[PDB]
């Protein structure tokens, strides 16, 4: 066989330890899922520093806690705009997930609160910016560098999927690189806690699994497809399926054909053919052996999964250190709080 | 080349969700 007794016993013991970890993680998650935290700070606890972005119903501001001096990324959502845009359930769900999960590679919700006009999610601030800019600047990551980030996503999805959470928006744009060089997953706006199938057309075109496009119901295996896309893009510098327009991208995704740069290792190509597998009965992450088909693949043979989880592996890249006040530029607008409560009933749970 | 095709695609920047 492939393994002698010692290797076989080591792998068995490792897999049993994962089970015990996930059982504890689920009990912790469910307590917070069933009794969410609410109203854990207020706006005048913070100084506003800079608007970092804006959206159709909200914006993100760099803020500083007045007493501790800690910096945070505060999402401000206008309740009336959330209602007008029909985003009540998504906003409530995103905050409920964020306050319940706990994992070293997930952005943390440190505080949340609401007032007459707005909802506030006070997030950990990662000044090194996202993987997207680093990847486009460097061009591509070497396979060891890509593997270091991929391993963190594998563990994060192992965690999230054990909680029946599907993430549904993996892409470099949603991955920050912290000051130790480790990944922080952000933006749980499309995440959903469901145990079977679901049907929503959501995600980003280049990262959509075929079964999302084909209007099948789909399951957590779409995240493993998206991991394939991410690894390919990290290692190549461009994604496996692209075109001028999304419809042409979808044709390529469902075709069952992917081509690889000549510098991809054989091991990498094998892993990607098993993740970018249109046939769900064959896709890694979706088989009898679950995540282990991925974690035990030859491309990950040098990966010490526990050392990654414990953050003891030396990162391949440390973003340039600047200072949490350092920080594209946006116009500054006031935070108007009405003297009348808006949309109170709709957001009772927040 | 594939890389040139990627540049020509107009989808080298941040990608929005659908
Ligand atoms: C996507 O948005 C544009 C630019 O900021 C890039 O770095 C990504 O955040």
Automatic annotation (TrEMBL), chain B:
Site (Important for inhibition): 11, 14-15
Role, per record: Extremely potent competitive inhibitor of cAMP-dependent protein kinase activity, this protein interacts with the catalytic subunit of the enzyme after the cAMP-induced dissociation of its regulatory chains.
Family as reported in the entry's similarity comment: Belongs to the PKI family.
Name of the protein in its database record: cAMP-dependent protein kinase inhibitor
Species in which this protein is naturally found: Cricetulus griseus
Entire-sequence positions represented here: 6 to 23 of 76
